[PDB]
Design a protein around this nucleic acid. Structure first.
Ligand SMILES: [K+]
Ligand SMILES: [K+]
Ligand SMILES: [K+]
Ligand SMILES: [K+]
Ligand SMILES: [K+]
Ligand SMILES: [K+]
Ligand SMILES: [K+]
Ligand SMILES: [K+]
Ligand SMILES: [K+]
Ligand SMILES: [Mg+2]
Ligand SMILES: [Mg+2]
Ligand SMILES: [Mg+2]
Ligand SMILES: [Mg+2]
Ligand SMILES: [Mg+2]
Ligand SMILES: [Mg+2]
Ligand SMILES: [Mg+2]
Ligand SMILES: [Mg+2]
Ligand SMILES: [Mg+2]
Ligand SMILES: [Mg+2]
Ligand SMILES: [Mg+2]
Ligand SMILES: [Mg+2]
Ligand SMILES: [Mg+2]
Ligand SMILES: [Mg+2]
Ligand SMILES: [Mg+2]
Ligand SMILES: [Mg+2]
Ligand SMILES: [Mg+2]
Ligand SMILES: [Mg+2]
Ligand SMILES: [Mg+2]
Ligand SMILES: [Mg+2]
Ligand SMILES: [Mg+2]
Ligand SMILES: [Mg+2]
Ligand SMILES: [Mg+2]
Ligand SMILES: [Mg+2]
Ligand SMILES: [Mg+2]
Ligand SMILES: [Mg+2]
Ligand SMILES: [Mg+2]
Ligand SMILES: [Mg+2]
Ligand SMILES: [Mg+2]
Ligand SMILES: [Mg+2]
Ligand SMILES: [Mg+2]
Ligand SMILES: [Mg+2]
Ligand SMILES: [Mg+2]
Ligand SMILES: [Mg+2]
Ligand SMILES: [Mg+2]
Ligand SMILES: [Mg+2]
Ligand SMILES: [Mg+2]
Ligand SMILES: [Mg+2]
Ligand SMILES: [Mg+2]
Ligand SMILES: [Mg+2]
Ligand SMILES: [Mg+2]
Ligand SMILES: [Mg+2]
Ligand SMILES: [Mg+2]
Ligand SMILES: [Mg+2]
Ligand SMILES: [Mg+2]
Ligand SMILES: [Mg+2]
Ligand SMILES: [Mg+2]
Ligand SMILES: [Mg+2]
Ligand SMILES: [Mg+2]
Ligand SMILES: [Mg+2]
Ligand SMILES: [Mg+2]
Ligand SMILES: [Mg+2]
Ligand SMILES: [Mg+2]
Ligand SMILES: [Mg+2]
Ligand SMILES: [Mg+2]
Ligand SMILES: [Mg+2]
Ligand SMILES: [Mg+2]
Ligand SMILES: [Mg+2]
Ligand SMILES: [Mg+2]
Ligand SMILES: [Mg+2]
Ligand SMILES: [Mg+2]
Ligand SMILES: [Mg+2]
Ligand SMILES: [Mg+2]
Ligand SMILES: [Mg+2]
Ligand SMILES: [Mg+2]
Ligand SMILES: [Mg+2]
Ligand SMILES: [Mg+2]
Ligand SMILES: [Mg+2]
Ligand SMILES: [Mg+2]
Ligand SMILES: [Mg+2]
Ligand SMILES: [Mg+2]
Ligand SMILES: [Mg+2]
Ligand SMILES: [Mg+2]
Ligand SMILES: [Mg+2]
Ligand SMILES: [Mg+2]
Ligand SMILES: [Mg+2]
Ligand SMILES: [Mg+2]
Ligand SMILES: [Mg+2]
Ligand SMILES: [Mg+2]
Ligand SMILES: [Mg+2]
Ligand SMILES: [Mg+2]
Ligand SMILES: [Mg+2]
Ligand SMILES: [Mg+2]
Ligand SMILES: [Mg+2]
Ligand SMILES: [Mg+2]
Ligand SMILES: [Mg+2]
Ligand SMILES: [Mg+2]
Ligand SMILES: [Mg+2]
Ligand SMILES: [Mg+2]
Ligand SMILES: [Mg+2]
Ligand SMILES: [Mg+2]
Ligand SMILES: [Mg+2]
Ligand SMILES: [Mg+2]
Ligand SMILES: [Mg+2]
Ligand SMILES: [Mg+2]
Ligand SMILES: [Mg+2]
Ligand SMILES: [Mg+2]
Ligand SMILES: [Mg+2]
Ligand SMILES: [Mg+2]
Ligand SMILES: [Mg+2]
Ligand SMILES: [Mg+2]
Ligand SMILES: [Mg+2]
Ligand SMILES: [Zn+2]
Lengths: 208, 99, 83, 104
RNA sequence: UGGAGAGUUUGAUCCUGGCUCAGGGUGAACGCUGGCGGCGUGCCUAAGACAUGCAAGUCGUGCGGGCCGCGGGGUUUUACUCCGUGGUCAGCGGCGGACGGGUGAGUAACGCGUGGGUGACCUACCCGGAAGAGGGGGACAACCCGGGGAAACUCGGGCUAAUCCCCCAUGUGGACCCGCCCCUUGGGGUGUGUCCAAAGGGCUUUGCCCGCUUCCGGAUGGGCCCGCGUCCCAUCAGCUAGUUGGUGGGGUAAUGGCCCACCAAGGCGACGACGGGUAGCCGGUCUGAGAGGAUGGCCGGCCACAGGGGCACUGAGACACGGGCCCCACUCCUACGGGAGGCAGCAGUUAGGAAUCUUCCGCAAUGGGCGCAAGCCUGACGGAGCGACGCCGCUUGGAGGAAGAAGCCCUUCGGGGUGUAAACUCCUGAACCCGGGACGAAACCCCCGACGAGGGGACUGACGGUACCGGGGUAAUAGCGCCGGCCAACUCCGUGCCAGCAGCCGCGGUAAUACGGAGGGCGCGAGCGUUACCCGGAUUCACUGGGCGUAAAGGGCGUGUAGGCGGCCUGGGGCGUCCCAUGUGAAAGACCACGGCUCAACCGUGGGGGAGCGUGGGAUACGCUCAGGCUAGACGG
RNA sequence: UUCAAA
RNA sequence: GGGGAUUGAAAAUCCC
């Protein structure tokens, strides 16, 4: 089961703020806000020049932790990326960005990814009409991701979909806040995203 | 126990005896004919050869000899008799051989 | 004799047959002489039945004896339709 | 097609049969170098025609005996014991390597 | 799209060099742990032994009959006897038991792989074409009557039907011997002579169905032969007498020392014969930048085997796993005379082992045997079951939540950790309950039509009340291994060269980040570690891609056999080499692209991808070969 | 003498 | 068999 445990601690081990909570991570409290040092009894102690390896490990752990995906699944995507034509780095990101659970989150249907995930597992999500509770489901270009008719009235749904009014969204995505529909226009360009991650090191980590 | 396909075995035994006997005849007459010719007795040597030919062919009607096995026998027979008769013979009965 | 029958491909609870020409004596999914079509029982695709009728007509012309089901499918593709 | 091989007669010591040495050439599967390699076929010569030293063609045939599965198709080049000599010598060197040895 | 290196010899250095680690794999096993599902997969050892059940039969539309039953007749009645019909039994006859299923023991071999040859051959059922089926005669079992055995079963006598056997015809036509044109190994045609055919059954009965016979083809499956390829040891040199070949026979579907009788002395080997060891081969699988290396479980192809040895009979086919005979070992009957048996079929037992599943459900589907058909048989197979054994998908919550409880840990005693983690608030709703509820299955068959095409109609679901759908709805498993360097992760205490750790280098003899515990941390997560094994890193056997003065390594030197290698010019050939076409290169797998299960795993469809080998053309620089020249190598005076 | 100490 | 002396801790050596 995708991690599930103290999360605003991973932010602390990566020395960078990851959004694994949506809000709370915006209001002075993602911990990174005054307490940016690693978790644990030695968190405040001076760090030692990390090994080329350490650097590469933490980088992958960053990107991977951002999407709350497992090593098993993360690796399988990367291997797929390698094989495919074109720059593995971007292509990899493109694939991570195509996970239904992620897209749900991108469209704002949920505040964080872990929430977006649950929304999927519980059928509150629809792809071209049909229900789909597979958070790893790969959204293709042209697919319409909406909210289940029966779920459109849920308290949590309104709140999030409300806050989405006026809010802009991914240049590769499009949100019709009305009927609570969204459309995966195209695979995001590396230029499209802006994750605190140097995918180049990630490729290197697996090249070892 | 008990597999009524014992019938195949008790049937093979009858077929075996039936074949065995047909062949024995063929041999006995073949040798007989080769012998008569080997002695220059042309007329009856063919007379016997002619039966042998017949027994061989009929033997091939069913699954005793069958095939080209028949051909082989007839050949090797008409072969020896025509040759052995080269001792003045002169195909009297002119039966089997087409001089 | 040689036949035209279905060879089973696909997976569990997901059969996908192959209209094939083969010796009656060969194992069902063994080496066939020629593939002349395919058939999907659950018709999970609009294209669940195809049959190289020209070829089917060929083997029939030389002796291939079709399974009852094999014959059924061939008919659908108008193999014997002599209109 | 019935395989046809060219070789040298290195033995006429049998009745209606000749031994034919056939050389073959090919790149070594791993080291490249073109290497030679030979094999002797017992060919059928019913007319006791061909002799020691002739270069004949050999052709794939209906078995004549055990060993014999080739018939001499024709003569390519008569006389030339240089080849036979080579074979004979190589065979004589054998008399060497064992428990004793032969002169070089 | 295709190549990463690190630790360890010294006081230090460079080099040589081995060992070791990081990565992929696996039919795994073992430890701790363990929630759900799909698809796969599961005796690697004793090819040890096996209780029990099931795993091959079908046909009454080939034939006669026995037993139990019912009905109708011939008689004035009974007895006796005739016909019809139901159930059942096995016979005779046919087709199938040579497929399907299992396992590799054996096998270094034409076994397998690949490409070819057969003028040296076979092929049941199926398809097309040509021509046929006139007459006679016969037997054996059922059954009946005796005899011999404990039994298994046997011996004799008598009766009888066939699509059983035989004789005579007809000979389309075919076979054989000679001849002869033609062609070319035994291919094809032709003439005389000789020889060779058959089966009957059904009926919706003068016509159709199912069959029979002889030929020529097709299609399918094969046999035999050949070129090339296929492991380790040369501390295995020589091997060989049916041995090598010939002539004539025998034998086979057919070639052949396959076998035999005679006659020759020959065959094989350092390009590894013979001997020994090991091993089923392949598509492919794992690994690798590649070249390679390793492997051959599952699925597909071929081969071999069926307790261990031999043999044949029957048949289109076997020298036959659930057929037969004999020898051996073993088990079990036994009246000790003599008998019965063979799970490497499914499931299961037992043994061995670190270790491997259910004595399950169904013939609904696909496929197979027999049948005109209805159908019957099918442990093939389609499913379910068990095992984290593997892969893929899922869950054990989501959002809010303190300048931050308690507890435990640490402390410079100020404070710092675990930690938004918890509590708690609010959402959602695995499980579970209720309702609906599949696809897979439309043929065979029947009716119309013409048993055709074509139309209509009907019967069938093991899986499964499962999947999926719709309601209702609970906050609801987390482990395991690491933290001295390689190698991501550090502090206290306890132990002292003890107890112990340790892949390699090394830790521990009172301040141990290395032992054990705790707090904290890293990694991964229904799994995590360990052991074993394969490839990698390892250019560490170097083809790609290594070396030999002193590191391991130039033979003590010469002579010279085989072999390898060969100067300059011209010509022929075209073997190597190169180019073009063309055949072959099974399917699956792999790769790319779309698709189907909500995704994926899994699966389907389509698409390139060629190496190898065969054939046909072409080129001729280089290598090769044959000719002829040349002096600059070599040799000679 | 052993292991380890700059 | 410690328990001391010695040792960085041992082996050894001298003590009970
Ligand atoms: K035929
Ligand atoms: K011979
Ligand atoms: K291989
Ligand atoms: K019809
Ligand atoms: K202490
Ligand atoms: K410690
Ligand atoms: K290795
Ligand atoms: K030396
Ligand atoms: K030339
Ligand atoms: Mg790429
Ligand atoms: Mg039987
Ligand atoms: Mg029978
Ligand atoms: Mg006699
Ligand atoms: Mg001679
Ligand atoms: Mg011969
Ligand atoms: Mg060292
Ligand atoms: Mg080293
Ligand atoms: Mg040294
Ligand atoms: Mg040192
Ligand atoms: Mg020094
Ligand atoms: Mg357990
Ligand atoms: Mg399963
Ligand atoms: Mg086994
Ligand atoms: Mg059964
Ligand atoms: Mg009555
Ligand atoms: Mg009866
Ligand atoms: Mg019966
Ligand atoms: Mg089989
Ligand atoms: Mg195998
Ligand atoms: Mg051997
Ligand atoms: Mg072969
Ligand atoms: Mg072979
Ligand atoms: Mg070979
Ligand atoms: Mg071959
Ligand atoms: Mg071959
Ligand atoms: Mg071949
Ligand atoms: Mg008759
Ligand atoms: Mg009669
Ligand atoms: Mg009669
Ligand atoms: Mg009698
Ligand atoms: Mg009688
Ligand atoms: Mg008959
Ligand atoms: Mg005629
Ligand atoms: Mg000719
Ligand atoms: Mg007649
Ligand atoms: Mg020998
Ligand atoms: Mg002969
Ligand atoms: Mg012959
Ligand atoms: Mg022999
Ligand atoms: Mg030999
Ligand atoms: Mg050789
Ligand atoms: Mg020997
Ligand atoms: Mg050997
Ligand atoms: Mg073996
Ligand atoms: Mg084996
Ligand atoms: Mg390499
Ligand atoms: Mg191999
Ligand atoms: Mg296989
Ligand atoms: Mg055997
Ligand atoms: Mg056998
Ligand atoms: Mg045996
Ligand atoms: Mg056994
Ligand atoms: Mg036996
Ligand atoms: Mg038969
Ligand atoms: Mg026979
Ligand atoms: Mg056999
Ligand atoms: Mg047998
Ligand atoms: Mg067999
Ligand atoms: Mg069998
Ligand atoms: Mg058995
Ligand atoms: Mg045991
Ligand atoms: Mg099972
Ligand atoms: Mg069935
Ligand atoms: Mg069926
Ligand atoms: Mg009927
Ligand atoms: Mg049964
Ligand atoms: Mg099955
Ligand atoms: Mg297991
Ligand atoms: Mg929370
Ligand atoms: Mg509630
Ligand atoms: Mg259905
Ligand atoms: Mg039925
Ligand atoms: Mg009608
Ligand atoms: Mg529901
Ligand atoms: Mg529901
Ligand atoms: Mg509720
Ligand atoms: Mg570290
Ligand atoms: Mg201490
Ligand atoms: Mg350690
Ligand atoms: Mg999983
Ligand atoms: Mg690597
Ligand atoms: Mg190497
Ligand atoms: Mg080495
Ligand atoms: Mg080299
Ligand atoms: Mg070196
Ligand atoms: Mg030295
Ligand atoms: Mg040295
Ligand atoms: Mg020297
Ligand atoms: Mg030269
Ligand atoms: Mg030379
Ligand atoms: Mg030249
Ligand atoms: Mg050439
Ligand atoms: Mg090609
Ligand atoms: Mg292929
Ligand atoms: Mg899809
Ligand atoms: Mg394909
Ligand atoms: Mg030229
Ligand atoms: Mg060259
Ligand atoms: Mg001392
Ligand atoms: Mg020490
Ligand atoms: Mg000291
Ligand atoms: Zn955060």
């Amino acid at each position: 089961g995708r991690y599930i445990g103290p999360v605003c601690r991973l932010c602390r081990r990566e020395g960078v703020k990851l959004y694994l909570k949506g809000e709370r991570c915006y209001s002075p409290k993602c911990a990174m806000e005054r307490r940016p040092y690693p978790p644990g009894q030695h968190g405040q102690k001076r760090a030692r020049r990390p090994s080329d390896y350490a650097v590469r490990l933490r980088e992958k752990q960053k990107l991977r932790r951002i999407y709350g995906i497992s090593e098993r699944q993360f690796r399988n995507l990367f291997e797929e990326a390698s094989k495919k034509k074109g720059v593995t780095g971007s292509v990899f990101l493109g694939l991570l960005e195509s996970r239904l659970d992620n897209v749900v989150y991108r469209l704002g249907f949920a505040v964080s990814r872990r929430q977006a995930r649950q929304l999927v597992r519980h059928g509150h999500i629809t792809v071209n009409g049909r229900r789909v509770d597979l958070p790893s489901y790969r959204v293709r270009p042209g697919d319409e991701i909406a909210v289940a008719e029966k779920s459109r009235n849920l308290e949590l749904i309104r709140q999030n979909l409300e806050a989405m009014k006026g809010r802009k969204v991914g240049p590769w995505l499009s949100l019709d806040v009305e009927g609570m529909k969204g459309k995966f226009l195209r695979l995001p360009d590396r230029e499209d995203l802006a994750l605190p991650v140097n995918e180049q090191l990630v490729i290197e980590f697996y090249s070892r | 126990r008990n597999l009524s396909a014992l019938k195949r075995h008790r049937q093979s035994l009858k077929r075996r005896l039936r074949n065995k006997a047909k062949k024995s005849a063929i041999k006995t007459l073949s040798k007989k004919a080769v012998q008569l010719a080997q002695e220059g007795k042309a007329e009856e040597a063919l007379k016997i050869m002619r039966k042998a030919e017949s027994l061989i062919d009929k033997a091939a009607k069913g699954s005793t000899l069958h095939k080209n096995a028949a051909a082989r026998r007839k050949s090797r027979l008409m072969r020896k008799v025509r040759q052995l008769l080269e001792a003045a013979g002169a195909p009297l009965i002119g039966g089997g051989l087409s001089a | 004799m040689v036949k035209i029958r279905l060879a089973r491909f696909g997976s569990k609870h997901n059969p996908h047959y192959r209209i094939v020409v083969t010796d009656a004596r060969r194992k069902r999914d063994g080496k066939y002489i020629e593939k002349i079509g395919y058939y999907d029982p659950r018709k999970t695709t609009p294209d669940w039945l195809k049959v190289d009728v020209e070829r089917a007509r060929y083997w029939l012309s030389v002796g291939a004896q079709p399974t009852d089901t094999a014959r059924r499918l061939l008919r659908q593709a108008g193999v014997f339709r002599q209109e | 097609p019935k395989k046809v091989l060219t070789g040298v007669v290195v033995s006429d010591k049998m009745q209606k049969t000749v031994t034919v040495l056939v050389e073959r050439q090919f790149p070594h599967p791993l080291y490249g170098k073109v290497i030679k390699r030979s094999k002797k076929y017992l060919a059928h010569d019913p007319e006791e025609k061909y002799k020691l030293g002739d270069v004949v063609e050999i052709i794939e045939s209906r078995p004549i005996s055990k060993r014999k599965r080739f018939r001499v198709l024709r003569l390519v080049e008569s006389g030339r014991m240089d080849l036979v000599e080579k074979y004979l010598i190589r065979r004589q060197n054998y008399q060497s390597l064992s428990k004793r040895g032969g002169k070089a």
